[PDB]
Symmetry: D3
Subunit: 316 residues, 6 copies
């Protein structure tokens, strides 16, 4: 049941940004570190029991010389095609969602499902500099340069760069999408790259961290709480929250300049409604938030229609 | 974690059939009652945000003059096409799985998602003769003529009759599929109709009721137990179990004479592995059972590949 | 523990009525449909190991030609007797509570325990016109004429009509009582019939639906939520809530003209305190609400004393 | 769901008696200590809202000069009457079940609901000699002389002595009954006193302690386990089990020589079926055990009928 | 997660005292009853695998001639030594925490861990005058003179008296400490005895009872709620809360005249933050409350440092 | 409650070793890689509120140039001293257990609490080559060279090398200890190094992986199962199990040639008794296994005494 701010308060919830003074410089230097690594994209054809599509394993190199991979599915016909980069949930990829990628291609989109470094298939070359609570949320959290989501966000940008370089994709008709973690990555990618034409984010994660750790009732935001339990110095908490502020999509949101479609379920206890309204209310672009009273952190059939209609409009 | 018979015992588990002497005659007479109702199919176009497919709402008349309905999606190209009738889980259809139906059409199959009477969209004209435990499992359970699944099984047969009558479907290349309740309906359809060429049943429900009510740890087999708690006469329990034996797919399985592909997860607490192995082991036809150690009553990615390859082989 | 409005706010909680403009006409037409069915009451004597009482199975015909039944127990002595119609909880009858009915008779009341159509023993002839979430709460919810509780409320009225027709009952000394669903039926019956002399309702269900589905933390109000999950159109939700408004006892409450005794447990999560205070605060008749801080949705021993004292006063 | 020995093994389960060589002498000496305390019964009228019965608060003195009390209800008619002493569940009396006691009187029985010392209303003058786990189960468990149930069992015997001394009770027609702890007290009373003519014990507690602490899945047998965790010397465990063996009803059952009716639900996790079958199988007297597949540690409607019929037969 | 008053409201939460007019007289008479019992301390040496310490079982006589005991560990060197009396959690002593007592001695403190009468090792001679809910919280709760914590508080005072009488302890350098129940005992002892020089209380229990029973989400404050369920008269609740008021440390707090160090975890559901801030805010002495956002009712490593530093300062 | 093999079967449970033919060579080569990294130990004093001890933060370099650290506490007196290396539980170190380390020093032992790379304070320089399930258990599991526990086991060996090099430690009297993951590290250290004189392992983790993943009911063995769900190729499962067999302490145990003391609680659902008995039964050395019926995966007081007495005997 309902548990967060009531809808009327959610609609006006817009916390002050927490971006440090060197927020832009950190992202600039981070993109510059990415650019020093040659992508060297590699496509390996893959058998799949469906006609009308060609499937591949796509691998490229990214931040920290990390090998990143995923399924890439293309309509079996003359291009150029509209394209989608799809990002997945936290610890929530099962053999890379190949069937979903094929279905996207059958809807007419050349689609790459980036697999998140350290979670599924893709390599995380970044070390564990100081020890962390169980999970990825606090890996390297004592420094922006070492934080887990630095590499992840840069990988998400590189995925767009790679897909746009292909002859069979129409570089002008590329979308980004995903749910929860995948939703955060969607907003981060649109904030950090000119490439995407449109974005659809399902109940995005990695937003309004300061509120998230006080309101969430399930994992994985509570890993942050677990880390503070195990590393109890007051200074550690201040540093950790500062680090998180560089990756908080509510702080990246103002950079987004493409149309955005977003969902939230009002009984969602993983990505609490307030945290999602926070990101949405910091967007200054063509946008729409679809609110679903009786849904939580889960597939919403009605939003699937909205998502398909939105990409059909902006990408075809 | 593991809980049913160990694998080596599952593989040989073949309970004695519980079909009463008038089993066949019951079904013959039930099919005769269906035949008296003219199908009178009606198709209504649906505006759906996808190319390559035409989407409809299909409605027809069935047993007891009931109005049964569901989404029907068709490849947007000259037929005739291979076809699929897809059946859904107990209390588990959310606006009829329209998106899944479209995806099946984009994989090349004219596909109808039959919606189960009284659960989702479709009408259940059968009354509640005697009072039942919360749910549909014990609705009319005191008589085979009034039992809930009588009308459901007949609707499932009528769905095939209707689809195979369409000009754009290749009547010789029709598949049936579904999971849990949907898997039970798949097996029941193939057993009660010559129309299906092939069948894929995910962890089928409605099997080996006698063991199911003693071994299941989750709903909905346990509704039967709930009914017995509320209606405790010993004669009532015997009568209810005999009713159920007419619908038990382990008793119908000997009629199936098309290829069958089936799945089971070994930690499945809803449809316990033993109940699924019982239906499987009562099949005498080309068959395969895919066993997944680490999965329960849920989507199994690896099995979707097998499902697609199996329909590719038999319908194309 | 405490979870709803604090007591001081509960005592003044009186939501605006949600009755549509044709509320009275719908009930008038509904009672007229009931009157067209001849009751044809039938009494079958029953063995029971107690002296001083005569037990029967009573059956009568009601709305939609439905066969309704229950245990009827009478003091074994010359009448006429004061009488009680007792209504049961949702899915909560176990072989009709025969022992409780006998105890009521031994307290000197000719007592009939109406069994709810489709739940226990009694027949529900009303169909499932459109499909519903697991349970009875959303059966026929898209239309007042087809809604499950239409037949149920009319049955509850007919029970009074039948009991009052008996030579051995004093038609002027008839009470109604029940808990949760049985409590709602108690208030509905007193609202729809002149027959009852007094009413005792334990934490009544079927009240203030709009608040109920936002505040309840257990079944069965949440079936409504489940239905909206499975049938997601905005228009479906509006229609469903309109339908419910005709059956909402907070809307029927003003019709009650007999003394009413009511209970509420402040930690009740099934029938939340606010929903019960809502019904109570809409009564304009001799009334009393007994509030129990440390009880939830359960038998309250202290209220049993109050109930017995209340019926002794008004019916003897 | 099922969990103890299967039925066919329960039926023959007869653990070797664990009674120490001084078992009889302990009980003889304990009864001698009771006899030294003059009962000095006191009856105080109670205003209760029912006709046909007179209600009292009965108080008497027992083992250790303890003040034991409970409701005593009597038919409002010339006696002498058949009588019942009713015993209650562990920590499970709510204001002494006055309403149930009245109902027993209206069924024709002069009935006293003995309230257990230290649990409800009654005084426990026995000290806590050595410290115990949360609860009464391990209070004084290091010595048979100080153990909690010594005084309780003696109070239960004294309740019968007191009731049988009343002019209005037919001393030759006295029953004992109760469930769980109440069932254990029922068997213990019949074993320690010649006064009861008949006994009905619902799923009796305080049986086969050695198995109980290994098989029970719920409180309160598991208090014993909790005590052992808190007092881990091996000598302490041996001594505690030996203390318990003096009170284990499977060791007392061979003394019962009146008709016995007993119940067990096969999913009962509080008093596991094996523990109940052990007491039953140690009875050598007219006996019956009613087994209910679908019930646990709870009210069984069908068994109430058997209970009433059984007392009708033996007390009337 | 967070559940009580927000921190800013906690810091100013100071409920009106609930001490009856004869509060001081009751404690005066209670201490006078204690003084009539000669302590007769007895020390029995005990083997323990550690050098640098001497271990003993200490036993003394207290209120109601009760035998109270515990482990007493002394540095193996010439005294006099600073000393500590350590009090334990409710039902939370496992063989008296001998290892912890030895560690205190190895930190240089002659340390006695008083074991709570009736809970662990120590005798409770006080009777159960009226019956209580499962546990100790409502034992004797209908009268201040009979209430369980009367004897317990007096034992805690006597422990100080005994330890201060020893040649090897510096009577001027004695501390008291404990968690939850042990924390309440710490504050009660400092309120009732001049002996302690300093106090460290971890999230103290037995505070602000009126709020506790409305806010706590786990045992054992909810035993009070359980008692009111089983003993439902309004007068019983008033009496019980009056009794509790004499033992409420928020009422004893003003008597404390030594430095106090206290902890609270903001997600603590056993001793809710409000109840602990209530006691703290009623202290008028040198004091400090350490607040831990991410901890509940559990060991807090950072507070262990604070506790050690505090006793080192005040006792060495 | 009980759940693994019964005790009589545990005592003889000795699974066949799963060590591959290159087991020894793997470990020899791994130790050679460690040896190439110069330890370069650094001690930094820490202000701690206790007399009789000097506290430090110890840091050294290990496998993969990783910075490993922990608290090192030493008796404040002329050495040389007996020493202990203490290893901690999975994800279970809270600021490195500084207080426990001090207590070990006050018991006379120069004690270092090695903190596990990537879990607490210590650096894990090993990458995530292929993606893993949430946790460390499946990090690098597709290759023995990259697996998480390779570096951990080598750090544990290096901790001993470092401590034994200190002037104030008696190199001939060094112990190892720890629980669960810490117990597994204890056994692995004694197996891979001649330095330890004695070992005490509480309910050791990382044993008999093949059974563990089928019998464990709690985290963290079940991460392996989670990995298999997310990476379902049959070849992946075989490879992962073979990797694990290099680290399985039941395969290392045959190398341990110092006295061993071990514990197991029979209700332990984390490290099931069978997995612990398997490691124990593969020991060929002076050994003892203490079995605790009533305890699970938790602090066992009685075992601490055994632990202290055992180190007293072997190190002093
Ligand atoms: Cl890290
Ligand atoms: Cl029915
Ligand atoms: Cl319906
Ligand atoms: Cl005791
Ligand atoms: Cl008491
Ligand atoms: Cl990895
Ligand atoms: Mg190909
Ligand atoms: Mg190009
Ligand atoms: Mg008769
Ligand atoms: Mg008449
Ligand atoms: Mg000594
Ligand atoms: Mg002195």
């Amino acid at each position: 049941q309902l548990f967060d701010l009531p809808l009327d308060q959610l609609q006006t919830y817009k916390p002050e940004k927490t971006a440090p003074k060197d927020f832009s410089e950190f992202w600039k230097l981070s993109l510059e570190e990415l650019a020093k690594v040659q992508a060297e994209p590699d496509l390996q054809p893959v058998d799949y029991p469906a006609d009308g599509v060609k499937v591949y394993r796509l691998t490229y190199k990214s931040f920290g010389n990390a090998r990143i991979t995923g399924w890439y599915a293309v309509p079996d016909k003359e291009g150029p095609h509209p394209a989608i980069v799809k990002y997945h949930g936290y610890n929530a990829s099962y053999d890379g969602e190949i069937h979903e990628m094929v279905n996207w291609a059958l809807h007419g989109y050349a689609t790459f499902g980036m697999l998140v470094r350290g979670q599924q298939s893709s390599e995380d070359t970044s070390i564990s500099p100081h020890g962390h609570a169980l999970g990825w949320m606090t890996k390297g959290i004592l420094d922006k340069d070492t934080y887990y989501y630095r590499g992840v966000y840069l990988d998400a940008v590189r995925a767009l760069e790679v897909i746009s370089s292909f002859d069979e994709v129409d570089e002008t008709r590329i979308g980004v999408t995903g749910g929860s973690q995948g939703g955060g990555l969607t907003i981060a990618a649109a904030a950090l790259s000119d490439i995407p034409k449109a974005a659809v984010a399902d109940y995005p994660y990695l937003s309004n961290f300061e509120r998230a750790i006080d309101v969430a009732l399930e994992e994985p935001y509570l890993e942050i709480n677990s880390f503070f339990r195990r590393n109890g110095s007051p200074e550690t908490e201040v540093q950790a929250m500062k680090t998180l502020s560089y990756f908080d999509i509510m702080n990246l949101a103002y950079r987004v300049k493409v149309p955005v479609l977003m969902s939230i379920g009002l009984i969602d206890k993983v990505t609490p409604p307030s945290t999602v309204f926070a990101a949405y209310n910091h967007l200054e672009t063509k946008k729409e938030l679809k609110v679903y009273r009786y849904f939580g952190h889960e597939y919403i059939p009605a939003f699937q229609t909205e998502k398909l209609a939105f990409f059909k409009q902006h990408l075809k």
